[model samples]
Target: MPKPINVRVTTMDAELEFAIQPNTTGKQLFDQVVKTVGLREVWFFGLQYVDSKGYSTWLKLNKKVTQQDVKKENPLQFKFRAKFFPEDVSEELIQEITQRLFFLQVKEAILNDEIYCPPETAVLLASYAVQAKYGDYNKEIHKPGYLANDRLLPQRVLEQHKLTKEQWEERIQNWHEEHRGMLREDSMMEYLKIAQDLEMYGVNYFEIKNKKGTELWLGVDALGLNIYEHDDKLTPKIGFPWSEIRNISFNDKKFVIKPIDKKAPDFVFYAPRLRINKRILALCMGNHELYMRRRKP
Candidate 1:
């Protein structure tokens, strides 16, 4: 008889434990977890666990419990969080659920200080959230409205808050006022930048100084790499297009980018933070491969 194993799942807010047979598949365990948590739509989240090597790995639904290599003493630690879109999202075409979930994720990231984005980007995303919470921005009715419709707020948000429609509306209005003041007048590029920033936004980012001693913050995405001089800047100082790059390689504490143009010299950057250095290198390799694949005949 297969013995039942105790598995513990940790989420953003709570920790749960489950008993399951060692032969159980990952999907079966995950289904039990969703039932325990009362999560209706399981597709928006996943279960992750740390491996013996101290690396976090997502549980593959098809794999067996024993194959996950769980230790008796250690609980199968997991975090239930919003799943990010695999590809860039179109600001004009993103669905309401995805947009709302993204807003929640970005807000959580800001609160936890896990990610840093420009005030412009922050304000822009906030605007979208408000739009999601309310209907399309009504310059007339929404300008001085004192109440929010229950139907306007996302179902997920409404499920957690026990507030009246008026109160919810007030809260949304106040939130918008607080963040909107930080934004300047809109520009043609503001919305596009918001989409790009949100698509590339992740926990992997850091500030590093160039050879000239000028500090720049760097982040990456499937499209390419973005470099900004400061968190408040509305635009990146340089956008390293993956199409123009000939090669990207990293060593001990440094990463290098070589351009396809022969006259252009290689750009060398150093990151003192080991984790950020590793993440940047990983993204470069991954995005470079993606870029190459898209260009194939």
Candidate 2:
């Protein structure tokens, strides 16, 4: 007898579309949905809209309102409706749609217990990283010859520096372990506790508060406590393999580090942010493995 497939699916009634007008932000859209459905943050929601000719109307989930500009290209429109039956009937009914929206994403590890990135995605990621470090513009790129000294080196030469799969894995593993060790320290926990207490006691409250036990420092009243005094001392130094991972380039003989894609999959996800070599990196995670590419430098 053949074994049954153990595919998992997390379904939500979502609406996606494109909006070219104003008042289109994730928080705003979420507020509208809350008013319409009377649901709170604990409840789950999904985007509802249409993707026509790559015109996105949905707000990218991570980007905050101030950081996003709606005036540019067609802004993605996303409206998430509740999937399960809600207690209220006044809310609009959600029709069941069997087609999988997570089709391409799911197989790529959208639901996986850990973050995973495909090999090709990692390569693109590495390419951008090279541009971030060595590129002259202070901007980012993936081509071989950056306009350094008003000259372009062969793209072939740059591609030679990327890392191989085994090396990439080793670096990522080491990075994770190093950060993990830092978080395990007792002094770190003590510092965190004090920081938490200060916030609770209105030490750092933004609202105007009279100086009682606090002291004025640098033209501003502080709670007689200096957080930064210990910042440098307590801050742990660690290495990450983000840009390092993305910059993996293959040449005729070996892989060299290179700039990588911004949207590559992150092998490690437990960290607060996907950081490689202490730099922030982005990744996509799902449930299954769909594809992987192998390249020789």
Candidate 3:
């Protein structure tokens, strides 16, 4: 018998070592890692590693370990992380693997409170995810037996409330009724925009409570500083374009956004966490530099 290959797996928080046969598929290794970590609903994540060229690459689940050039001399490390869009928000229409991965991430984010949006928005996104993964809502194709599987429905959601197969089907029906003329591409873009506005979506941002006691998250991208109300993307309450900004600074828990127009009053935001204030300052400065380079004639 051939000796088992030594593999090192790294996740968001831990590093692990495993010995498996060289012929073991990436999916088998991933499943073993998932079990070791006690992670429920493992579909949202995948195993990847930084290649010799320093580019991050995913391990193909269907292929054997030996086929991928994951040699023994290298550390044989795999980074277990979010399967899709690790950095920068994705705006393209969701389809195929992207659609499936996005749905699982969104579901995970909502459960963890890492992303917040309206209930209707969550349901709508979930519906699309289900459609993307299982195909169109046909009673015969997506039978009650299939819906009972953990891979079909989010484990967190299922545990929170016991839902019958019919209930799940009805939810899909409601989504179709609510979004009657919208194409899948359009619906996907809408949901993507919502995700883009979230703090966890990789956009640099901070959360703060407004005077009215409503929670708002502020983030910076190539555009400017945008104030979002619970991940809504229809319209921003305020957008401080980098072109119009004179200075931005932070003091402990309070961060200030100063505009170029002296008459335009400077805005002050107070973050509950000190780290939020620091991150806001760092993101604003980074965005400003990028904005400056783009505007150069």
Candidate 4:
């Protein structure tokens, strides 16, 4: 029997339903999303579902739908997200849709507090953000109060910054009002350009166990890999910059990062699942490709 699944795009609040057969793979569902969005840069996006273990993971494209831990619900829902980041948005990405997609995903990502933005930066980002969503002519009609009904800042963002809702709203509105003549696309362009510099931007963290069996978060971003203590995401305990690294390989859940120094021993850690390592390698491959590509410019 053909089963229907609910797929939610983070940026777009639409009830998009895709009917899938039992034999459908992640690639099939992913392809459906790509076609629906008319996304040409498919490699940068993925179908993400929260693993029952409470961690978000990319749905393996080659696996059967039954093999993965898709929530067994009436409408099996999943999130489509942008998984990779471009270092130089102005230089690297040229397409309008791609830029808009990045803008939308970054907006949602910041709003959801996934990347942990600092208060001041978050405020500035929100300024550009309101302009992004409501880049039009009338400030009298759409003032600070209007943002009460619409999306503005993240929950954590407002409280920590010593600003009340209306207070923060005033600041955002000031910038938002200033950009009255800017178009949505230009607003988004500024957003992406500004967002790329955030330290936590596009960083993916995985819970991994080390030699001491100490649980730590292994983070990968545009620059290189980082090691963070469990529960302390704001700071990294260690980092393996790609410049010093020699090789990264994995066997089962155990993965190793070989340092450039031949005398140095290999640093090893174990993931809770094999998929983490797979994703790590995939992202590293994509990141490294861009890492070298950026060297040209």
Choose the strongest candidate by TM-score: 4
Tens-digit lDDT string for candidate 1 (203-271): 234677677777777767556676777653335677678887888877767878888878998887877
Which candidate has the highest lDDT of all?
Answer: 4
Point out where model 3 deviates above 4 Å: 1-104, 111-113, 136-139, 148-165, 173-223, 226-239, 251-254, 269-274, 286-297
Winner of 3 and 4 under TM-score: 4
Q: How accurate locally, in lDDT, is each candidate?
A: 0.58, 0.28, 0.63, 0.77
Which residue runs of candidate 4 sit more than 4 Å off their true CA positions? 1-13, 50-55, 66-69, 72-75, 212-215, 229-237, 251-253, 271-286, 289-297
Which has the higher lDDT value, candidate number 2 or candidate number 3? 3
Residue pair clashes in candidate 3? none
Order of candidates by lDDT, top first? 4, 3, 1, 2
* Candidate 2 TM-score to native: 0.19
Candidates 1 and 2: which is better by lDDT? Answer: 1
Per-model TM against the reference? 0.52, 0.19, 0.47, 0.80
lDDT of 4 by residue, 60-176 (tens): 899876679876765666887777787678976677778887888888888898877777777778877777666673857784487776676778876765768888877777777
Question: Cα lDDT of model 3 overall?
Answer: 0.63
Over 225-250, each residue of candidate 2 has an lDDT whose tens digit, in order, gives 11112123221122222222344322
Q: Which stretches of candidate 2 lie over 4 Å from their true place?
A: 1-12, 16-26, 36-38, 42-67, 70-297
Model 3 scores a TM of: 0.47
Cα distance off (Å), candidate 3, residue 22 = 26
Residue 16 of candidate 1: its Cα lDDT? Answer: 82
TM-score of 4: 0.80
